[model samples]
Target chain A: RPRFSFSIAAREGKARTGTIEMKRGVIRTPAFMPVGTAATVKALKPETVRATGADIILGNTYHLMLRPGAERIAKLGGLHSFMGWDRPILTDSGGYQVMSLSTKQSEEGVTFKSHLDGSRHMLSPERSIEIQHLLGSDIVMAFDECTPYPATPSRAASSMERSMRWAKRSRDAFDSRKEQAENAALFGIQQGSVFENLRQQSADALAEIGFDGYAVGGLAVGEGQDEMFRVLDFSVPMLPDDKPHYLMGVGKPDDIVGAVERGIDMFDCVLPTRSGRNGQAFTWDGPINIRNARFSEDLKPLDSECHCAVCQKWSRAYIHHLIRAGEILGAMLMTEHNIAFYQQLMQKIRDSISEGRFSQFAQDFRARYFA
Target chain B: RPRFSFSIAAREGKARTGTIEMKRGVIRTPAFMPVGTAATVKALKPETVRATGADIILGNTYHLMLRPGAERIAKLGGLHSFMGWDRPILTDSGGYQVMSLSTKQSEEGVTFKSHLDGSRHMLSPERSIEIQHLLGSDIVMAFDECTPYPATPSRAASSMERSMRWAKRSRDAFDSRKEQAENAALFGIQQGSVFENLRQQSADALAEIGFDGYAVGGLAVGEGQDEMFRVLDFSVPMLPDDKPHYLMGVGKPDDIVGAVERGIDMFDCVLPTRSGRNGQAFTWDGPINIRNARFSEDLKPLDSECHCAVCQKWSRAYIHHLIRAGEILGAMLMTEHNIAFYQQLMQKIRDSISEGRFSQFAQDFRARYFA
Candidate 1:
């Protein structure tokens, strides 16, 4: 039998910090898992990313299955050996990608056009589970519909009900694949737009089949911070308390802090990874567009508070020149710094939670970053 | 007072190993300098470039002075501080770019348009020296016309004569700027378009004018290896033995070895850096194209003989995927590996030269690389 465990270490207000133990490694809670969408973190090396303090990272099932193909990665010894990252990797269920691709969705499944080459493909619950298994993901997510923002109650209800059915099918598929199921943990995602009742009902449906953990899906999609918080305010409490709670595609530094305050344990976003490539840097002083002319002769580090390799070795003038000149090292250094910044932020969040000062921490952080 | 000195450390046939000492750093003889055209070495950090065993680097006057402007770099604390590479940097006189840019050439100088924005610019020897001064270059190159390949001997003679005149003017300009001149060493370029007699004439003209070092130019301008070697055989011996001999834009691993055998001591090229970004890689077994489909699942290191960070940490399959996906790390890792390979090759060449086995070393290297 394979072992997987999650336990809380500290809590402040509604916030909780814990660790999720998997076969590959243990993930620190309130963790920000940088998105490695296409088997690689856009501009960073795996070791470089790991040194930035990340214990786990997220991969896209849709991307892997489409381009490299799941079977190909499996032949090459799975995502771990393929990307040279042997840490715990959580792969999405392909449902979110299907939704994002705007494909044809039916009660049973979705047919998506491959974003890379426009090839048509269908992904049912069983198919999603099979793909994740082939990719050899440590944590596999249950397939579900991601309810769009501002959806009507009836539309959201129908979507939520269909998602519940998909969750059960995904659960049954995991049960049948005992060879993979024994080694990997599966998580069911709950989706109900921003409605509390639907969210609780969807959570109830998932709990009946159960999962190793639960993810709060479809909330950070264009819903403002206040509204997203409102959904988490009512939705997170409805899930099983002991399971790790993941916030899918959740956002900026302030957003992560707010979600941490609301009992979220995990996150994945392209904000830092993508923004870094685009010359955007996240620091204690908020974000700086490194391509700006003002930074040309500014000899300070990217952030005076940052202790990352980029900050420690390179100057703003140097990095600014790199970015403006469209050098890859510009993106590489900026991305390294930004990822380091995010991981450090996560570390601080973890420390605050352990110290029982998460409330004060979040309050001051929001004031500082947003101000 | 600023200090700069050069001395040969070992002798083997016509090949000698030496070092050029400067205020910032020392450059070992038979050195292969990676090109940093736009202030950055494409995908590498200065530390990373240094880790690949680089002692000095070459920067482009045309690129830096055009986009960021030389005054801007000087204002920002010079190229070393601007690029976070606090080492010796040699600036090309921008003569190659001015000539390649299809500019109107005359006795006064070359009038060229900025390649970036088509802005009008002039590169008389005086202005060229001033820009290098503004950039705070450690080793300044005398401005000269790069005689194009396939030229008649008369045309080559005319171009070489004009270049010698420009070298005199360039020396005068460097002499006029006492503060800059005292701190920097200027090198005059010998250009004769692969004609042995013309090369001797150009070398004699440059030597009569007097300079710290001499450069063999106009050889790598589409001339074949045999023809380039023919030119170097006579041209290189004509330059003073007490002075450093540079081969401008000299080529592949084989080319560098051949040049070193003919008494050349310094080299700079964009081959390793640019080719790596374009999916070409140098290895002990010779160059490999990473974009080849055969490498998709090949989990071996980039080069079994390479101890570079990229090769030590990443697999061929991983880099192959990154390159196939057009990810930035692909270029970053590949460039790192190639630069390291070149540096390692240079180290081996220097070792062989010191041991008086350069002929045997070159023979083995050619048989293997050309195999």
Candidate 2:
């Protein structure tokens, strides 16, 4: 196992504030990982991404494997150097992406055609682990099918058990790469389609196989917040307490607050970056579309509380003009502000937990955000 | 009239190096102003554009007049506050753009439909000057017809004479706005479509009307470099030597060098920024298409001599992947590098002129660029 460690600094109810220590850097708990799909974070530079107080970012195995190829990235140093981001990178297993495709699944692996070029590909547990190793990912995810929403209990049970089996294979494959494994950490995923019994079984299976950390998947797949919280109410406690807990693709400001309260220590989502590019700005008081007629003459920043360069230097009226005229700088400024807003939200969450005021803080945030 | 002063620091052959001191900032002569067509330098932030060593940038009067409208910008505190660039801005007269549209032209002015919304609009010399004034332009250009290339000698002479009449109207209109004129300078444009006698006649007419600076117009409109140089050989001497000489829409590395040697003091073009977005990168040797197969595995910067942030930290292979995948960061990085390259070229031009060895330096630059 690599030298990965997690330590809790404070706790209030189910919410915990802590830090994950690794050779690359320390990730403060309740961290939000921005999605850098296709090697770049859409319209932003890596330096700008880092300046937004982000400790880490997530790369997509599926996108990289199709376009630039993992072998090519490995030959040119690694993902860190290739993308100009030297901090820790957590790459998701190709399982979730493969599940989205018209995949032919078997006991061994899943085969699908590339959405980019219509080329054929396969992603087995061993192959997924190998690709992550080649890309020099710091936190590696186990290959497992993301069970769809609203599945039968029997179908969910079968899928969760198969993922558990693949978890063991992923562990073995990762361990075989002795040199690369010395500095990297592997994380196993828990999958069950809203069933308490299946969730416990999946958690127990992953515990038996062992990993440095654990992820609660299979939620956030069109399952609304209420149902997601219902699943997390039991799914999270079943996993070991000492390891870091990640909720994959989980998000929205409210969703993050609820998940952190339910013991999620890490998160990744494309809401902020994607919404920003589309002219939707997430503010402390809900999201606003920049193309609105009211903003044409209003001289206000996207978020008054945000200290991001975009907010500190630009106004709503300016951003409105850029977005309306279809300028690239519009997308760039919006993305930077959104990312900064998310980081600030995470910071406040950790501070509230440390101060033993998380409950009141969450209530206040919700009041203003939903007002 | 608005406290604008131009001084020559050194002169070599026809090349002169100096500064144009204004209230906003000092513009170094033989300067290359990046085209910021809709209030932005495409994929760059205003701070980033300034950091790339550019003292000023060009804004399109036509685009602003159509999309955001000059009155809207004026209400929001003008272009500097609107775009977040607090430097000198030189706005074109909307003459060249209006000529491109299906328009009704007469001795009074040109009437045309808006290309953006098909709205009926008319841009006489007075209206053009007013629009630029509303945008808070530090340096305004006179509205003149960009004469079409390959016209008969008589037609060229008639067009040039008509523009001279517009120049007088533009001057009078600008002078009538006492407060605005007190804080802004106007430049009259010389148009003759490569006819030396007509160019001289237009220059004499502008001189009789009296303006701050002069632009040698209508040369970069698809006429080859040899023809443009031939037109400049006689047209430049006809203009006043004490004031700055601007070559409108002049381009390419070699063309700039040729123009600088022929007494041109300022230039603007979209080649660097536009070509960058289209995956073409300019180097000391020549322009290279980043999507070319050879760059797929090559590990180098866009230009070895360039010290822009893109060149300092990124590899050609990374850019190759980005441009090929249609990533926006690719366009951002490439545009930044190209802008930096142009600024660096301008710096070297200034240095060589001051050193009194511009002729030899220009020869060396041409050899490497054309190789």
Candidate 3:
């Protein structure tokens, strides 16, 4: 009932530039939604994040639901007003966090202790949908088990099958919430680990259940890039061509490029934000750790070409000192630079697709970034 | 030696506007020196601090000498190049830190344990002067004990007498470092706690020894405003008329104003930097704790009139969230605001003095800040 539509503007090979029209706003794809876990993009202001070309940001259902509590946010006037970010917000179901907590589990759902206060919480398909609906997310993820890596074939298969049932229940729960269904678009998640046949079966089940879009989940969870790529190579092609394809929790510069090249249209990751806080900076030429002694006297910017406020004003020497001194500005400046870098990478990818040079751009980017 | 001159540009009542011309640069009087303890101003980049109208900054001898080692900084092209601050830097004599560390208690010097490694170290007049010279400071404080409050007359007098002897030794040690002396200025500290006569005696001894400048020390070490102002009322006049009067380790908004009203021309304090890290924001009206729940939904700026980058661009809600979340941007934004506040205060003081309305400005400022 909401305006959830996708239009491909340009295509070169499988790489395409498109736009997603949602009730909240238009997201120019291939888009990178900066992660605003806990209702903020770490060190950056929302406006600053927006200025860096972010149309939407991913917020976590688990963290927000636990801390401020979903009911409190709704009473205070919804997630957007509560966090002061008015753009389209895509919220994850508490499923991934349920997997992350590594708690006592069964086929029914996840029973996990709250990481915040050690309180008990159980997330099921119905409850997860209810939480996302309360969150007022423009894009909601269907509750599905995020199968852990190094999983046995039987374990992965069982989890994937359980997630399919949960996905059906999640879709039904979403359909029941008329206000959410009218205002927000829901996306079913495919979680078949790394097996091609399993992925195909998962995608087919999701297609049968029906959703606005699809997300390839449970790939970047310590499964090597080669394996993740191999899975996506077969799995992505099985999804509906007309709907947007999202790779949830897919990673670094190389991971993003590989996913994009494999026909993935959306992504969300904490690599840039987390790496930044830890003094690792993502530049065009790989990552540079600011805590290194080499930067002690280097006056160059983090990335000479970065136009972000942090790079434009501060020198590597200053950032290095701040990092070594354990000053907060180090993290703040690095986070800003990394987020800007990620957004810029996304823009570059979009531009390359529009110009019909995505292959060339990807090759060149890899050569430089990997060098 | 090096060109070190102070001239009163204007005077209105007891408040004075002046300039201190040194070899490195000219410092506008009533300047607020952002504390650069440990070779960095906590969360601020040096250039950012400079952009906030800070002409000079105070560096902690105790911290730097312990960690980076003053000798190392001298070898690495001096503190300016090492720290990336090209402007003038004033180095404290480690006296305040020595007092804080409770190192040694004798007429000669203090043997204190390093807070960093628990290594034993001694801080004497000559050693302090030597370390500061190695740091290549534009202005160095003469090593002196910062007499603690609630001391008996004899105790205060004995401390002041020992500080006078140390001042002579500091001057002699400074005199021996001819190269550093030709480019840097030395300042003697008057130590008497809240004792007026002891302060006068120390000031007279320093005048006879004839240093580049004089400082009113031992006052803002937890002594109340009335007591501090009473000491400054008699002590500032006792120092050389033509030399700049420095107020070491001072103060809050009202305290600075009161000190300025007593003819003090310079000041250094960790209030802005320390308070910022703790989420206490200094505004024109008063200071506010960002952790307060009342600010959770307030969309107002920290101060409506403040032009600082933090104030101009961010809402109190955003800052409050950052602080509560313990994000680095909280400290960065708050430090910028506080430094900007101090600089603006100094500018206002200078303007009021030049326009012959200093007394009126001071009164109005106190009323607003203390309201």
Candidate 4:
């Protein structure tokens, strides 16, 4: 088996159906990676997460570094053994979370006080790559500024250029560790806010330095879906067409459908897990709040079409009671269903792309979702 | 199938190895029913709870009645379908919880304000039996006042006499619901604090009314183990020798072993689940707090003798980090192991009794646990 490989089997316009095969496992594209923020996908177990049809999960570098620490994870036989998840794990650079903290950014890296203990820390591109390596990450993300949303054209350009520089450092650091580099694949992050020219320049720089994959970053920060879609329409085509393109934190079912149609291959988000914990469930018709009084006696399944165990065995009334009573199983069941919903969405996307009816599927999906 | 039947396979002194066969499932005595208050075993799924080797679980009529209401559970196909557990469920009468709340007691029953919404409600022997029937309980506890600890002998006698009267009323109410009674077993509770004569009087009243089983209640509140055992030593012999005897709201592992030796056939407590979530784990060597700094880098399993999934797959270090970080999986993994530990304890107790080595086993267990 290859350390990392992508093969597109079919394409309907820019939406392609394929798989990314690695030593750990084969991830079906376009795939949705559930966020395991702190070595857990929140309330769901690793076995439960896998049972929900997930081929891969994304770990948050920021949370792990602060809690268990990268060295601690490596000492305990890496993140896979530590978390009891042996499947492919993609860890983000600490840059994203560090940006959200009270961080001081310089060309070298970002220095910040730990939100947990107020302890000082530094996260450079080199450090981020080394941390991912220590974590035994199968897909390592490049350390880059998640360029703030709503920046001026010049501000976005400078931020994107700085991120491009960090991408090179990240690549060099990843390459220096020969054994780690051979076993893992690093992905460069394209950061330019929502500016088309800046994104192209950022993509060109990443292409020049090169990576196993490329991610369209910085859009989901705060920009509305319309601006994000407009940016993707021009920006996605700028990256290499053959390699996998990830829309970092690209979200909701509709957003993912649109991004997939615009040629994105992989995505990761915390919406499903977070929203589910908060008593909201995603459905084909739209997300529904289980806490709502209307669902108290609704005897129907969370999603009528979902084949997940939670849907197969439990009722809306029971889950509503659980959510209302603040039961943890409510969160667990809701999360399992929401993740299953996302995986089902991805499966349908893959099928529609393979069948050459992705456009029609997207149209019908929007109508039902917004109905 | 019989609604309830018990057969002792072997005996060593007062300790007996037996099986209580019920329509839903056969429970191996002496059984430890993990309290599934609010329909869930707190932070654990019903499947996970079953996987922990529990043949039966105890549901809190107090919590369930207040939150989802017993009628809603009946409408949702009863607690079995509602919580996804197909095995036997033992539901306690609301008397225990109502005593803990601000309430008014009468000849009929107790009227209490809901701890959740402060709404008022009544829980008579009739209402309690109805709620248990609505929950489709396989074993129902009779409604009775849980006599407060440190009560004067006169106060204890009054409380015990009142409980005995309520037990008679509970039996009549249970018999009135012929369909529900035919499918379920009702247990009368003996409550007289720690007074031997009062307990015998309470037992005599219940014996006259007759029941499928009998429980020794009103002891675990604030009284130390020595006094509790002193009372159980005398009180347990008062119930019918052929019927299964339950020691309600008991205890630590040692307390359970001592009770079993004193002729108790059933036990239920929140120690394992509640303590586990609070970062304390039950082990062969007593209990250990996972939040202690010493376990932060320990690579050993939570318990060396355990074969639980959590212990098999995760290390103390990982669980320590989770607890320190306040992750939900920490509670989940810890609770699973603790419950597994209790079941393992019960299994060992049964095995020892069957082999006629229970006395020696209990001695060794106390030595190791309190080492």
Candidate 5:
């Protein structure tokens, strides 16, 4: 395992597969980490999340700090022990959520009237790093401004510059936690909403500061797929090839396959879990809502191609009835199946890249799924 | 497998254990059927329910008829395939719920303003039997009025006589569906509201218009455990010993051990599941509420002696946190653990009866659990 560092295993053109290694465990690339926002994946057990072939899972710093509190989780024995997942954990800085959901934001930090208690709280770069350290995060993320979508060059550059400065403060704060820093890796975020030249400047700032990895943030906010891919085309090439490249808060099935083809190695999203909870299921034939009346008597499994446990044992009609009946097991089964689908899809994407068949695989996948 | 005939494998005093063979599967006695009120057992998967050692589960005709509709389930392929429980399913006559939850009741039948949609529907003895047949119930129950508690002896007698008439009508209607009647067994309910003479009359009425099995109903409705056991003492003796004896909607752990000490060999209840949803777990020591603040950092399994999947994999601390957060997984794990404990308790009861140590088993169980 590449502890406190990352290494690539194989490459096909610019698309590659690798592993993010640490003492806790190795997360195989192009890993798809399920969002366990509230210390638990919405309706799944730690073992159930692990059983879905995920080598790692993500946690939201915003939610944890608010409800259970960071210091409380530390006392309970780190997020790993607290949640019973001994595998690797990548905790994002409380930046994205606080920016989007909280009341106010500034260059130095953001202030949240807590979602749980409505009490005022603050999270600057240094505080974000400290909180991640408190969680004993295996993969720590530097706190940065998640630049708003559709921003002018001036606005995006100003946000990007402040983030670079905060990255340094985040790095310094992380180094002060000697023991945790020795075992953990910190990744810096590159944010310049929709502007390639600005993205290049942001990448140059990140390169000068250096990091264990680089993440492309802000793109998934609301930009159309083509515009985002155009930014990635010029932006990803600007980062160091030796380190892992991460794309944060992504994505639908096509978005993931496209990003992997453009050289992103790590991905996380709530699409699978949240969509399943809302009665939608991901499959080879795009996504389907199990609640559709036509499926009420469909005797087939949710997917003919899926060999997941939910599909192996249950029929669409049974699950259809479950979804319509407001039963949680339907959500449980759907979530489990979706996570399994995503992880398996990531595996296939990795395999395609390694086999030099990514072009054919991507084309066929999009044709069938997006048709 | 004793599908048509109820054959006792072993007996100790009155406590006996055996297997009820149906074409679908064998239900070992003394069987404890988890109540799947609708098509689901609330917060549990059918496979997980089966894995907890349950050979069969019970369904409520009242809930199914109003919501999913009996005809809909049959068209979708019967209860067994519709719900994904391939094993035997015993459906109650809807008599209990119709009387209790419906708007009106009379000598002819009951009228329901649907609990789910508030649409009006009528349920007669003939209709109840037909609904069970439509659902493809393996073990069907005869439709009868569930006499209310604390009635005058004459009031009790009147209720018993009407239920007897309904029982005859139920049997005739059940036999009219000759295809389903060939594979399904109907059990008659004896209702006397705790009056011994009325009970004897009800039992005699059922004997004259016999059934494949008999159930002691109108007890466990508000009567104390002692009074119910006393009713069982005289009531059970009157049912044919060769036929299986069922005790309806019973009970707590102590009540189960005591009733088995009398002649009853089958049971069903929502206690385990409903208690589980409310954060209560049935254990060897007794039921314990997981939401108790004392359990917040217990770092122990829900039950030390239990080895169910929930017990083996999760801790009280994690489960406690889930319960407090109002997460469905809390209900999922808690319900699973309680149902597992209940089924295990039934297995212990059966093993004790087979080994001719049921009296001692019941006594030791009663003292410890009740304590």
Candidate 6:
């Protein structure tokens, strides 16, 4: 295997438009994959998600492994067939979730209680990689600790070093399975808590170990916007220019724009799906809460410019009633709108980069969208 | 005002296909309007409900009067604008809920604690009429007791007599609002539990008082299908044929088919929408609980023949995961599916009637659907 390769079609300043072709599918650079965490994207059906221009979606290894169990999904014919989504699926390695169980266990892979059944289970790098391989994901994230934000230099350094060790184990486990190795791409995660030198070291280590692509992990955990951009500003440039740069757990509309502008090529976040269920709809103008009373009698669409089925057909008043009544359609409609919004944003960014006007596009977009 | 005309276009045995034309819209008979109690159908968007072949939806006086308050809805530009549904809406009088309230009350009206907030409230015939009028309903029901079944003959007689008196009050109140009377049609509900004589008497009284349409109420209230059918057999022929015959709160897929076979022209119930949120899905093959473990790995659509957006795009596995995860999208998708099932049933019923094969259709439907 040639690991991974990227070809930049056009460049405007730091922002470059490109495509990453894996065995599974072609991912247009600066792509935003909606999170389908638990095998479904909240209220959206997989086809609807695909129709909204999502080339891929992210599934949670932690939730799936805990509930339905990876073995159960495999028996049902892998995650793609099981979820009825016939497209590329990127699965996290449950490393972040396992690390989150720190309070319940000592290192060396944590034994944590399942939130659903309260049953105790262990998750190591090997087990995590094994689960993702069984899931038959197109892109598998190598198991690694996601260091909490605002950590001291020593604390961050220790977490990064440990994650690097886990990454090696994950790679070995993945390599052992010839079927998964030939078909799936394994991406290593770079873990450093917003430190430029630590980020550089983590990236360099991953490159030397060799992986399909690299992810800038451990940001967007209450680090706020400016600090995240500052870290991405320095961190993304250090990653191999020939490989896809993924920003994990990234971001709101503006955050994605900023990260993409800094040469980050891929992103996965629950903001569009999760926040959608809570009634916050991301639009070109700004975020609109459907639960607000003003919408109770307003007859206008959620967003006039939005061509999403939800926005095209439903009114603000109708959505308001659904949200206020605690009806599920509210979440479904809002999630559809948010996902469409994010996908449209990504498409616009891609178009700008391709046309060699990304700087002007980003400046104009941030002026209207972020203002 | 021509006093709402309904004419039978075709009939197979006692089952008939007809049309009810009022000022607002023309409703194809044997129609099922999904219940939107509290001015909103639980998890469905109005346009989506309409797209399922529904021309009208029912709103509740009891719930709306308590929440947004009828007067508030009037000030906000009536039920249509407030709820964001432009199509015809039938507003039920508070009678059924008022009678159902197990509370201390008097003969003129009932005083009961609100189910939502435990606040005290009252519902009288005059107030119910005024509220429906204020809501700008296309079809308004006369306020009357929804007599409970298994009552003593004397109790049933007295309750029916009291409801007759309230029906007069309802007519008087409706007559006083000239503008509303011009734009809306009032349907008098015949209530007498399951007693044929009492039903005949109530129907005669409603005919004497006059109404735009007639409804056979109180049949679906714990009365077995046989008993309900017997009541309809004797009571329906006594009502005027020129006006639409509506069956209130009359039931499952089979129950609806049976009621339509007995000459009922219009129906409204909460089974489809409510059961959908509870994880029940209605399919022509049979009703399936989406929460069942069997669906956890099923990649098939909810119904192979269903053209509803839900069935067209989603898999049983995805729906099962959402429902199991307590994701709102599950409820939304299920609601859409159930509503589509109902509307599709209505269309099939209408088609059968038009083809003069309703009896054959009904028998075939029950054989497979009930089995």
Worst 10 residues of 1 chain A by lDDT: A1-10
User: Across residues B260-327, which tens digit of lDDT does each residue of candidate 2 receive?
Assistant: 99999999999999999999999989899999999988888988879798999999999999999988
lDDT (0-100) at residue B114 of candidate 3? 85
Candidate 6 chain B weakest ten by summed lDDT = B98-107
Query: Chain A TM-scores, one per candidate?
Result: 0.98, 0.98, 0.96, 0.99, 0.97, 0.95
* Interface RMSD per candidate (angstroms): 1.6, 0.7, 3.8, 0.9, 1.8, 3.2
Alpha-carbon RMSD, each predicted model:
2.1, 1.3, 4.3, 1.0, 2.4, 3.6
Error of model 6, residue A318, in angstroms: 3.8
lDDT of 6 by residue, B149-171 (tens): 68998999998999899889999
Residue B34, candidate 6: how far off, in angstroms? 1.5
lDDT of 2 at B39: 90
Q: Chain B of candidate 2 versus the native chain B: what TM-score? A: 0.98
Clashes of each: 0, 0, 0, 0, 1, 0
- Model 6, C-alpha of B305: deviation from truth (Å): 5.8
Which structure is stronger by TM-score: 1 or 2?
2
Deviation (Å) of A56 in candidate 4:
0.8
DockQ for model 2? 0.88
Q: Is the docking of candidate 1 incorrect, acceptable, medium or high quality?
A: medium
Among residues 3 or more apart in sequence or in different chains, the pairs in candidate 4 whose N, CA or C atoms overlap within 3 Å are none
Residue A316 CA displacement from its true place in model 2, Å: 0.7
Indicate the residue-level lDDT of A69 in model 4. 93
Q: Tell me the TM-score of each prediction against the true structure.
A: 0.96, 0.99, 0.84, 0.99, 0.94, 0.89
Candidate 4 regions with alpha-carbon error over 4 angstroms: none
Instruction: Return the DockQ of model 1.
Output: 0.68
C-alpha lDDT values of all predictions: 0.88, 0.91, 0.85, 0.92, 0.88, 0.84
State how far residue B309 of model 3 sits from its true place (Å).
4.6
Of 1 and 4, the candidate ahead on TM-score is 4
Give the native contact fraction of candidate 3.
0.32
